[PDB]
Amino acid sequence: GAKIGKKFENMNQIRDYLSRPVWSVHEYLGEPPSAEAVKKLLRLSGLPLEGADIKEIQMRLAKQLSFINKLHNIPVENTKQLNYTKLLEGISHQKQDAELGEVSGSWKATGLAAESKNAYFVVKE
Amino acid sequence: SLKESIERLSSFQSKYNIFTSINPSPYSETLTGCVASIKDNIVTKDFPTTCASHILENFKSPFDATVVKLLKQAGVHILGKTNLDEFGMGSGGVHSIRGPVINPLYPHEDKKIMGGSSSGAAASVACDLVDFALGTDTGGSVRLPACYGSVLGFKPSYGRLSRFGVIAYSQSLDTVGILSKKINVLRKVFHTLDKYDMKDPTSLSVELRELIEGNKKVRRPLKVGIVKEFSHESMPIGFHRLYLSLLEKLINLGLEIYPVSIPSVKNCLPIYYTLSPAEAASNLSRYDGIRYGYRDSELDIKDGILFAPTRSKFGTEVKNRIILGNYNLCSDAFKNNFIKAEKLRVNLIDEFDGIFRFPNVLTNSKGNPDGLDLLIVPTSSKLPGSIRDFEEEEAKSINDVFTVPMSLAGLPSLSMPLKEKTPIGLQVVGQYGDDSTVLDFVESIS
Amino acid sequence: YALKCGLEIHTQLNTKNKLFSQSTNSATSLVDAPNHHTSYYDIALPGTQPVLNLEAILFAMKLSLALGSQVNSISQFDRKHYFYGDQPQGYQLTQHYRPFARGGKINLSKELDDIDESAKEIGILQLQIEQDTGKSHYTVITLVDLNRSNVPLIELVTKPDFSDIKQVRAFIKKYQNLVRHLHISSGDLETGAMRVDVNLSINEYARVELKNLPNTSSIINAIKYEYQRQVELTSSLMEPETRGWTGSSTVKLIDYRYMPDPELPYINLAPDVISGVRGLMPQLP
């Protein structure tokens, strides 16, 4: 738990405190997933399988997971309600904001697309 | 000098690779005539917003971000958009389709890193090209480059500044930040942008802002803590002389300094690298080339994987994050790592609440009357290395050890230089919502 | 043999505007020009953010009250992740972990509902608010219209209380009448304003779910087919399997990485919302 000590009386007390035998965060912080796991991950990430270095991904992920899995050994230790009038007041004050492009036809929704067909977006089979 | 300022701009741009785009007419209310740069993950009507990514290489937003709009209304001149690590992922400022930003504290042939991900932002301020810069800070991405540029870098409390139009990396952590050499300019900009925005569902409510204001008390004197867990890293040569010099100055001004232990900060990196990649994978799910941005010329599918041809143009580091993030979100890993990280994050916030005098309006802590007003913590434990060394070291296997805890807890934190043109800094940290205390303190001692 | 049948009913709400954006929720989607009723958010532009339409809360309240459901003290929206042309964010917002309401029921009687049983109650599992997706038109290139993306839906899941097929028909009929009477939806199966999925299992065998049923006639037929088809069996029906429908027969047919949305606030309603909305309810039959 968190703790506050006595006030420092002079600068040398701070120098001693900063020199105490205490480990750094660096010192405190010091079986890869299968190839089928990486391929699954690449698919969920919408990334290509062709050209992917599977073993390299396995290795990197293995290191990453070993770092975050340090959490496995760390143990563990009434908000603003929306009421009726606020519900109804909130509803009554809802409107279309020009700065959000909420008015129908206020901007060309397909205008930023590299490809389209008339007013439709297109996806190729 | 208007022609001389433009020549300086052109020279520093070519040597240090600071901007991704520049106002066609460079240097032509409250901040009238101020010049700003804007990080290129913050959308603008008048410039492309690329996120330093092939994915959005020529993306043009139909709208300005709220922070951009507020600055324009205050009469600020936007000089251009600054280079960054792709999609805000990176701490060195080296991952960009435009190439790395070079640190202008050194000759450009030295190829010293600027730090990231607000690399261009910090450089533009260090070079005296702009009066201030907006960046974003997710785990230290404003404070760290500011430290390396020897300028002020402020990350305000979570939710104070609007994220509408701020391209998402990790929404529970993302914060708009401000960089400048002048504390007076930084405070004015913060005051201009510290506003409730109804477009942003995470924007701090007007009610809560007033609650915060109403909790301010006279502190006689200010009580400052030195954090045990942050006091034992190997620091650059000369750091301790500068650090102790600053601490002695404070003590001679009648401030009280205390040792404090906040044990939960040691586990912040594993927590961060569980939650943040998960959110990133989620937020980058929209990119497919169908509605905007880059699109593969021939294929919307490959290997039975939809949008893979287009999405292959993500940077390597971005793709690394997406893959890890998706791992963390899968059913088994979620119920284990993600849920645990969330609880530890809550724990961390409770530990901060326990040592701060100021009440936390988000957790309804009472505040500790025997507690502290500010924490003083190093910004970094490393000097900027060369771009070569950084990339070499990155391919092997922490620069955010000091900055991540305040991100996780949404605390206001300002990195300040200890010496002119020296890439060494200290963070002044306050309780959630106590931004004015942090800023006024820094103003007081400069 | 015993039929254990349940229904999953998606219903388009007729709020004026959409669920997480104030863009228009159009009642004339078939004639509308494509991608016309779409905000920056609907197109999932970089930097856009969801904001909950409170009218969807009101509508969900009225339905919960009519069913006698228990409204959750806290509900939340989660992200259901997958890639598809009509899903611009790359995920759907839905209430997976913490639904708006739980419990409730609908009473059926022989007297009023043409049921063999004098009285039969159909229990409700839960009630969820979620986003609709865009519309895809396959012409090979597929055309995507996002007018319907982000339209509010309520998903109602019943308990497996259906034994007879007459019960299924009577329930759908009454549920349609209810949503129209509460003025929260047209309840029209023809327009897609209401969509009915089925899950069933005979005599405690593996659960099978029937998808893509366009009208009440097709639901009844798929159920009857699947019932007799399963009776004939039996190693293939040991594990759960989702099937489809083709007018004549039923044919056979991913980690969604559910994550609570990190931006949207919890739905935390004060007790007076319950009593307040109660007073605004129409007389029920």
Numbering used by the authors:
A (entry chain F): 29 to 58, 67 to 113, 129 to 176
B (entry chain A): 6 to 33, 42 to 410, 416 to 464
C (entry chain B): 27 to 165, 171 to 264, 270 to 289, 296 to 327
What does the paper say about this structure?
The final models of the free and glutamine-bound forms were refined at 2.0 Å resolutions to free R-factors of 22.2 and 21.9%, respectively. Intriguingly, the side chain of H54 is disordered in the apo form structure, while all of the other hydrophilic and hydrophobic interactions between GatF and GatA are preserved in both the Gln-bound and free forms. The linker loop connecting the NTD and the C-terminal GatC-like structure is completely disordered, reflecting the flexibility of the NTD. In contrast, we were not able to identify any substrate in the AdT site of GatB, whereas S. aureus and A. aeolius GatB structures co-crystallized with ATP or its analogues. Inside this tunnel are several electron densities corresponding to water molecules, or possibly ammonia.
Our recent study revealed that yeast Gln-mtRNAGln is synthesized by a transamidation pathway involving a novel heterotrimeric AdT named GatFAB. GatA hydrolyzes Gln into Glu and an ammonia molecule, which travels to GatB through an intramolecular ammonia tunnel.
